[PDB]
Nucleic acid binder design. Structure first.
Ligand SMILES: Cc1cn([C@H]2C[C@H](O)[C@@H](COP(=O)(O)NP(=O)(O)OP(=O)(O)O)O2)c(=O)[nH]c1=O
Ligand SMILES: [Mg+2]
Length: 426
DNA sequence: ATATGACGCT
DNA sequence: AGCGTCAT
């Protein structure tokens, strides 16, 4: 394998929600502006920021009323609200558009709402003998950088770009249809044309990674951004990882990586390499001394599971602070309220994808519990009717109340998560 | 007081 | 089945 079988990409839309609202209300174009959920408490919570607005310091998970103190001429599109919660239809609609476009090129896996990994390996082959040995001109990759290039014997940003591109193509071996670096270059032209096509047909710009496995392609994606792609070649990796902080590797963002530093005593992805696959396992998993040991050597094998369609549909809403729920009548209302948008989507799912969910998950968080899901009770799901799901998901949870008046509810709930899983082909 | 989906482990 | 972890 040597971390060079597949050709894998990760496309990712640049401030996805913001572009969607930027394409709708065009005054928002080329202006610093963010998108917000809810309006009462301090102007709303941010979730997405145009890059002209990150220039002032505006981050997500920040109060719109605070980021207005960071940015003065910062515009504000609010996410459509329905039944007192977030109605993200707009963006899922935009999402299905871009994935229809991408799917035309290679088998893709829907990563997030705005991300898709692509398995270009099967495609790069069906082109290398379908062009004889074409020189592969620079004009075909007008948005690609080559991480780790150019080497060296008054440049601006695009000056430096051309340079590394021509260094790539110069040592290119358009003859060796086997060389791994050459196929990288092929998948990249494809991603150039994929990326060029999405803009052509949605107006949405995005950024890509092109490399040999899921992980490199993601880290590659975020390097040059926005409206750019990076081709982290197998040879880039020792330079790229030498100073890459370990937490920037997908899967290493959470606890595992946190302890990886605290146990091994390091900070960068390169520092992780001075250990045996045996040695690492004793400090971590039997699967994690392994996975790490290949990763820090630029090798990963988790395949692009081709799947453009989520396995689960779910509606969630938080009740933070003094807005937690403490009434039998209050919990019941929202569970219906949640069940009402859930029906809507499930029917949208039925007549779109020809499938139907079978089990319902009801989940709640509690004021106090150091947990997202303090409870998660998985039940049955026949007909797509809210009142049925409403009452049934309630009767699931009614027996963890500890108020001795049954009109009230305690400890109050911070979250209701209604989630439909197990879609059968009917 | 920063709405969602994927998966792993038991 | 039901928790815990990771992610956008
Ligand atoms: C991380 C995150 C994202 N989102 C929404 C908003 C994003 O616009 C959209 C994709 O999130 P992203 O890919 O992490 N960031 P972005 O697409 O807005 O900006 P960029 O990719 O860094 O250019 O999903 C949430 O609603 N809650 C969250 O916690
Ligand atoms: Mg994005």
């Amino acid at each position: 394998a040597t971390g060079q079988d597949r050709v894998v990409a990760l496309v990712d839309m640049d401030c996805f929600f913001v572009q969607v609202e930027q394409r709708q209300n065009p005054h928002l174009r080329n202006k610093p502006c963010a998108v917000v959920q809810y309006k009462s408490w301090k102007g709303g919570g941010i979730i997405a920021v145009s890059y002209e607005a990150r220039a002032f310091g505006v981050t997500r998970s920040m109060w719109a009323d605070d980021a207005k103190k960071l940015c003065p001429d910062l515009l504000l599109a609010q996410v459509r609200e329905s039944r007192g919660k977030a109605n993200l239809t707009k963006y899922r609609e935009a999402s299905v558009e871009v994935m229809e476009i991408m799917s035309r090129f290679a088998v893709i896996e829907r990563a997030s709402i705005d991300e898709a990994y692509v398995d270009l390996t099967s495609a790069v082959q069906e082109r290398l003998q379908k062009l004889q040995g074409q020189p592969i001109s620079a004009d075909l990759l007008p948005s690609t950088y080559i991480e780790g290039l150019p080497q060296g014997p008054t440049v601006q940003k695009e000056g430096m770009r051309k340079q590394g591109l021509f260094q790539w193509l110069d040592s290119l071996q358009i003859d060796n249809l086997t060389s791994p670096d050459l196929q990288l270059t092929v998948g990249a032209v494809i991603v150039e044309e994929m990326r060029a096509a999405i803009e052509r047909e949605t107006g949405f710009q995005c950024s890509a990674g092109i490399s040999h496995n899921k992980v490199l392609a993601k880290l590659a994606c975020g390097l040059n951004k926005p409206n750019r792609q990076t081709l982290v070649s197998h040879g880039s990796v020792p330079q790229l990882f030498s100073q890459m902080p370990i937490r920037k590797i997908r899967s290493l963002g959470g606890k595992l990586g946190a302890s990886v530093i605290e146990i091994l005593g390091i900070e960068y992805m390169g520092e992780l390499t001075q250990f045996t696959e045996s040695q690492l396992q004793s400090h971590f998993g039997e699967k994690n001394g392994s996975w790490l040991y290949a990763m820090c050597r630029g090798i990963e094998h988790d395949p692009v599971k081709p799947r453009q369609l989520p396995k689960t549909i779910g509606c969630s809403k938080n009740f933070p602070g003094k807005t937690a729920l403490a009434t039998r009548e209050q919990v019941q209302w929202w569970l219906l309220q949640l069940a009402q948008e859930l029906e809507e989507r499930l029917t949208k799912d039925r007549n779109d994808n020809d499938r139907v969910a079978t089990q319902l998950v009801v989940s709640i968080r509690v004021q106090g519990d150091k947990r997202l899901s303090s409870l998660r009770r998985c039940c049955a799901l026949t007909r797509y009717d809210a009142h049925k799901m409403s009452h049934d998901a309630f009767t699931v949870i009614k027996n963890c109340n500890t108020s001795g008046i049954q009109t009230e509810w305690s400890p109050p709930l911070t979250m209701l998560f209604l989630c439909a899983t197990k879609f059968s082909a009917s």
